[PDB]
Write a protein that binds this ligand. Structure first.
Ligand code: EB0
Length: 127
C-alpha cells in the first residue's frame, strides 16, 4: 500500500539550546554504541518505513515516532541540552514498540532485550 511515511524526527535545530556534558558523551560512546551493535538493534536503527514493512496503521497509532538512527544523529550533532532529553527519546522508542505491538511478539522480545541492556548501561551513567 501507499500512501506515505511522515517526515522523520528532526536531528538538527540551530535555535534549540544545547550542551556537551560528559553524560551525553557516555550516551553516545557507551550506551548508543553497545545497543547499536546488538543483533536486535536493526529494526530500531531507522524510522519505521510503514510502506516497506506493510504497517499502514503505524502512523495512525504512533504520533511521536522515535528510533535509534535519529538518536544517534542527535547525539553526533550535539542536539541535546542534557542526558534526560536523550533518555526520553529511548523511552519513547521503547514505549512506541510496546504500544503498537503485543506482548510476546518477536519485535517486543527484541525491544525488551534492548531495553534491559539500555537500563544496565544507564545504571553506570557518570557523574
Ligand atoms: C521497532 C519498529 N517496528 C515495529 O514496531 C514493528 C512492528 C512489526 C514489524 C516491524 C519490523 S519488520 O517488518 O522488519 N518485521 C520484524 C518482525 C519481528 C522482529 F522481531 C523484527 C522485525 C521492523 C520494525 C518494526 C516493526
Amino acid at each position: 500500500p501507499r500512501g506515505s511515511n511522515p517526515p522523520p524526527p528532526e536531528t538538527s535545530n540551530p535555535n534549540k539550546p544545547k550542551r556537551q556534558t560528559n553524560q551525553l558523551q557516555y550516551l553516545l560512546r557507551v550506551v548508543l554504541k553497545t545497543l547499536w551493535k546488538h543483533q536486535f538493534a536493526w529494526p530500531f536503527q531507522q524510522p519505521v518505513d510503514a510502506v516497506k514493512l506493510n504497517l499502514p496503521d503505524y502512523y495512525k497509532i504512533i504520533k511521536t515516532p522515535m528510533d535509534m538512527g535519529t538518536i544517534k544523529k542527535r547525539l553526533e550533532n550535539n542536539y541535546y541540552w542534557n542526558a534526560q532529553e536523550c533518555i526520553q527519546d529511548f523511552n519513547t522508542m521503547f514505549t512506541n514498540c510496546y504500544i503498537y505491538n503485543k506482548p510476546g511478539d518477536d519485535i517486543v522480545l527484541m525491544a525488551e532485550a534492548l531495553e534491559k541492556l539500555f537500563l544496565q548501561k544507564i545504571n553506570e551513567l557518570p557523574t
